[PDB]
Design a protein around this nucleic acid. Sequence first.
RNA 1: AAAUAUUGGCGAGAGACCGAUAGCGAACAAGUACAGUGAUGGAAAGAUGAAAAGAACUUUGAAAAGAGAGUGAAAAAGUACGUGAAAUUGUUGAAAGGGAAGGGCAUUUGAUCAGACAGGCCAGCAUCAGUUUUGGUGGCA
RNA 2: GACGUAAGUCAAGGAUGCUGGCAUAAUGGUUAUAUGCCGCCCGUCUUGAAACACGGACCAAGGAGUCUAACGUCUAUGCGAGUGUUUGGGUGUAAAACCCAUACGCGUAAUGAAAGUGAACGUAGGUUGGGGCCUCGCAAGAGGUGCACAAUCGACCGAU
RNA 3: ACUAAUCGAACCAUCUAGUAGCUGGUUCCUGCCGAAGUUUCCCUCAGGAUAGCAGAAGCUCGUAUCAGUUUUAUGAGGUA
RNA 4: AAGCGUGUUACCUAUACUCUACCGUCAGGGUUGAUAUGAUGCCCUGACGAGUAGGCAGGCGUGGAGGUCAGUGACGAAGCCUAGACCGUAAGGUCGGGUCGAACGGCCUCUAGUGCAGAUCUUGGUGGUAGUAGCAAAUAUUCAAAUGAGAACUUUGAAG
Lengths: 148, 185, 156, 127
Amino acid sequence: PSRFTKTRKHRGHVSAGKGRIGKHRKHPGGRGMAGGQHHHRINMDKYHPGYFGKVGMRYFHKQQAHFWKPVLNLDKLWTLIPEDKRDQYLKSASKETAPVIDTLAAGYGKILGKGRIPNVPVIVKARFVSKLAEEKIRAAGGVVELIA
Amino acid sequence: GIDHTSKQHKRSGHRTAPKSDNVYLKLLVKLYTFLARRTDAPFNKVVLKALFLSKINRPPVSVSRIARALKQEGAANKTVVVVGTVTDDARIFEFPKTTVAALRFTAGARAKIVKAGGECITLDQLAVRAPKGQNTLILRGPRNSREAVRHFGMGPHKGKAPRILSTGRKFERARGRRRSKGFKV
Amino acid sequence: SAQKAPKWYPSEDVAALKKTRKAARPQKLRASLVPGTVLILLAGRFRGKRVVYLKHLEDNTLLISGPFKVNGVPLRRVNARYVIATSTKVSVEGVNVEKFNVEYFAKEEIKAERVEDQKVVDKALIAEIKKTPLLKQYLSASFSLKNGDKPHMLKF
Amino acid sequence: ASLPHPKIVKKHTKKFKRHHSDRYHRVAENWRKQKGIDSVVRRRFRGNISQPKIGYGSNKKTKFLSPSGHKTFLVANVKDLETLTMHTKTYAAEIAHNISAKNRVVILARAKALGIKVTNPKGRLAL
RNA sequence: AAAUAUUGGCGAGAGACCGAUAGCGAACAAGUACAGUGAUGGAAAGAUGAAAAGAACUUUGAAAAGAGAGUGAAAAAGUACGUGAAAUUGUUGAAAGGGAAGGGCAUUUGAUCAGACAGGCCAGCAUCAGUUUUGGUGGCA
RNA sequence: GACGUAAGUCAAGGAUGCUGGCAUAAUGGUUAUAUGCCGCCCGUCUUGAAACACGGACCAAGGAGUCUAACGUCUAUGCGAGUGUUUGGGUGUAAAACCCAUACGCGUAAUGAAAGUGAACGUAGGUUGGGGCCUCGCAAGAGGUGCACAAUCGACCGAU
RNA sequence: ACUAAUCGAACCAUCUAGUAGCUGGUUCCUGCCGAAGUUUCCCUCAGGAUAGCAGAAGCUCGUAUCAGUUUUAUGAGGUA
RNA sequence: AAGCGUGUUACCUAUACUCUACCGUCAGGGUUGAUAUGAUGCCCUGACGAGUAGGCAGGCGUGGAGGUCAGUGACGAAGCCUAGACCGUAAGGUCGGGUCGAACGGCCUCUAGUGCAGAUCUUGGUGGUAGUAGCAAAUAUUCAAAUGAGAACUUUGAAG
Ligand SMILES: [Mg+2]
Ligand SMILES: [Mg+2]
Ligand SMILES: [Mg+2]
Ligand SMILES: [Mg+2]
Ligand SMILES: [Mg+2]
Ligand SMILES: [Mg+2]
Ligand SMILES: [Mg+2]
Ligand SMILES: [Mg+2]
Ligand SMILES: [Mg+2]
Ligand SMILES: [Mg+2]
Ligand SMILES: [Mg+2]
Ligand SMILES: [Mg+2]
Ligand SMILES: [Mg+2]
Ligand SMILES: [Mg+2]
Ligand SMILES: [Mg+2]
Ligand SMILES: [Mg+2]
Ligand SMILES: [Mg+2]
Ligand SMILES: [Mg+2]
Ligand SMILES: [Mg+2]
Ligand SMILES: [Mg+2]
Ligand SMILES: [Mg+2]
Ligand SMILES: [Mg+2]
Ligand SMILES: [Mg+2]
Ligand SMILES: [Mg+2]
Ligand SMILES: [Mg+2]
Ligand SMILES: [Mg+2]
Ligand SMILES: [Mg+2]
Ligand SMILES: [Mg+2]
Ligand SMILES: [Mg+2]
Ligand SMILES: [Mg+2]
Ligand SMILES: [Mg+2]
Ligand SMILES: [Mg+2]
Ligand SMILES: [Mg+2]
Ligand SMILES: [Mg+2]
Ligand SMILES: [Mg+2]
Ligand SMILES: [Mg+2]
Ligand SMILES: [Mg+2]
Ligand SMILES: [Mg+2]
Ligand SMILES: [Mg+2]
Ligand SMILES: [Mg+2]
Ligand SMILES: [Mg+2]
């Protein structure tokens, strides 16, 4: 709101906080990104290195839906089970009845291996897995099922 | 005239009160002001100062962080004190039965502590049962893990994050960031 | 409401005064102020009259009567700071003076007993004055500062 | 009367009139602080007007006290007046300017019966 | 076809908008009066009173008008009309004024004005405390 | 603290006692004037303004850091590994209030130009400090544990 | 030269509130703190960015890693 | 010497130094078994106070909005005038008298087209100049009568 602004406190003072010498002007250094290579060069190299120039190969007509692959770590793998159902699987870490986790229905593309799942066998249906995420799922007795 | 050695009329630079207008936090400050003054326990003075802190100065404390601190030798039965919010953490699967005193609990954090057999209490209940902070263990969350801390201290060779909106190729991965394009950092 | 209210109110308690340590001790007079001394009154109705000092009363005033038959100044009080103690003295160890105090001069025609007390003290005082010559004329004449009088150098 | 109070020292009894408020009609007597670069009044040259400053602040024991020792409370009716029933030695009622003549009669008779001082017991009277 | 657009037109309902130098240029005979060869440019201007009850009648004046009288709650509302500021002006009163005037501190004089008797005002002396100043005298190295 | 045997007294953590006059313009306030001394015209640019620099004859009214999109820091608030009801739908006392599904945005993963790959040797490490807590201590201290944070050597992930 | 008091490119309206590193102005009070005209770079020299000076928000702690100062010890310098 | 050189005292007075009071700021503290209900309150202690550009903080005032004071008012609201009074360091607030005639305030919050001495600022109004500069080119007017309140200027006659 206007009543809390310094404009109200600058009433009565001549320059409104802009100085008598500097004498607040229209666009003293140019407009926008002007002089990024000439008179604003130091600010660019200090705070935005990499701004000028080109980087690698172009991609005509990029569809981000091609590259959709949300990653899920192993420490969050057991969150795909509802919590009331989750405890009776943590107890009785048994094969012949193992939770089937469809990571795709929860919206994940690749299972990654941040690790330390419990020692309960788990059936993981994943589009992709990392090598280490596969090692820790098999070490717990489970298996990774490849889907599409 | 006086040859002044230090700046005159200088405020201490520390909060003497919370900026918050929460009436119940003011009652907690009112209770722990009395305890810090009428007791010699350094615990009460630390808690009173922590009640003044801003939101970024009291990051959330995970229950996993609480559980790791209870794995310390001789700390398995202490009252964990968090002047701030205790959040849940699903990455841990074995929580111990302990008592946590905190300013705020999330719904998941309250459920996890109670389910493990423990108890969630407020800071006024902590004061009644531990007036001098006996057998307490103050826990603080990670303060430099904020996303704004990444960009603090930007400059050449500093290895800090640039203040950027859109990331990827074509956004500050060129001249100034690699030897093939002018110079690097 | 034209004015809202004081949010809380100041107490109308009349706090008692702290215990002051100011004991009242008797006045020390100038050495030149001794009974029998002739004094010059510096102000009041009897400005510049020469009077005879008799007693130091308990209100710290000076009891004087430069004899009423001599110069007309009756028995009355004067402030010590408003008189000049001269070097002339009359022997007063024959004058009944103990009867006069602060209560004698309480304000509230002349009272009949006051003129009788005057007619007793003056007889025992005028008799001593007639011994040393010219004091009756001295006490009937008024003091005055004249052209060339420097009180800082005059030895009264 | 009122409560006993120390002797009230005003510390500056003169109004702080604005510089050049007598020179030009367009400049009001309401105090404004000179902010000119060359201003002799701002620069505090000898012989110029004194600017208000915190050194002139009144003693807190006698601040807001009227010469009779009371603080002034503006009242508009009987209910406003009866607020000061137990505070007659620290507060004197002053009847608001827009109170009608008949209502001033009622307020004064109520304040007289309660022993409340009235700052202006002469506005809108048949005298 | 519908879901979409809509500073034009027609009919509506509203507003934490503006309140006659504002709000449309225009609250009013406003795109008017007026200016320009022309294209175009483009104002100012609201308020008596509840009701004209808008002052009959007398008197002075050539008349305007004035003085009364009257109407009205009010004429300190008289169509030169609600209120009626300032700049500027007249009259009256007060004050001061040797080539400016105005101002700050303090007091004299003149004017004017507030409160208090169940302590208010101004003082004098004594005995002390704090800070000082100016003398007199004593005992030692 | 001092004196006094004590009671108590005192000049010892800040004035009391006695007395008079007036009780009103007497003191005081305000204002005009007089006198002593002082006082150059403001604003502005400027190293420097009373300037023989510039604007200002006077008065009234109007008159100049606003709103928006996106964003940095900080703070407050809600919830919290999630968060964001208001594009919409339902409903309504109807531009309000109240309720809600699926998505989507950001976050929870990075790195590489890219193809791709993708975060625990260990009590999520070792060392030096570190508030607080615990134990022994009359205490000073000593020992244990040490969150945040600071330094350093490692380990893991991506690139080379 | 003249082209309607307009001519080294008329007048009218709109784009248009054209841009201006340049001039002027930028409206209440009090309290606390309180500068710079210097570094580097720029078609830079009446400008800006950058570092410095300044304010504010504080945070971690609680008498210290300290200091526009001296002493002691040990270096260095090539001006009077 | 009231000049020059030198020496000795006394004296004068800065917003400087010392002491005290009061204001504010900062810092360090005290204060809950009725603090004998204000805990951003009350109180104790110490230090400090210049300031352009500039930063921050606490407040004053204006238009409109939610709430409240069952607030004020035709027995006078608002406005305006008032060398009349009071409060605040101040921004300002409050009252008395006059004038007037219909609406307007206090407090807790919300909101802004929110505060003017300047911009050769905009619009309107008014001054000093000032009863002043001037109303002097084109040869030139005069007399009587009439009319009229009033005739240098109208009408007629006569003349030039
Ligand atoms: Mg300033
Ligand atoms: Mg100005
Ligand atoms: Mg300027
Ligand atoms: Mg270049
Ligand atoms: Mg005042
Ligand atoms: Mg200057
Ligand atoms: Mg208009
Ligand atoms: Mg024409
Ligand atoms: Mg009008
Ligand atoms: Mg009227
Ligand atoms: Mg009138
Ligand atoms: Mg009228
Ligand atoms: Mg009128
Ligand atoms: Mg006038
Ligand atoms: Mg003078
Ligand atoms: Mg006077
Ligand atoms: Mg002078
Ligand atoms: Mg310039
Ligand atoms: Mg120059
Ligand atoms: Mg100047
Ligand atoms: Mg110029
Ligand atoms: Mg000019
Ligand atoms: Mg002008
Ligand atoms: Mg204005
Ligand atoms: Mg809603
Ligand atoms: Mg995005
Ligand atoms: Mg052309
Ligand atoms: Mg513009
Ligand atoms: Mg233009
Ligand atoms: Mg300073
Ligand atoms: Mg600084
Ligand atoms: Mg050399
Ligand atoms: Mg001389
Ligand atoms: Mg200052
Ligand atoms: Mg408005
Ligand atoms: Mg009125
Ligand atoms: Mg009306
Ligand atoms: Mg404006
Ligand atoms: Mg103006
Ligand atoms: Mg003339
Ligand atoms: Mg002619």
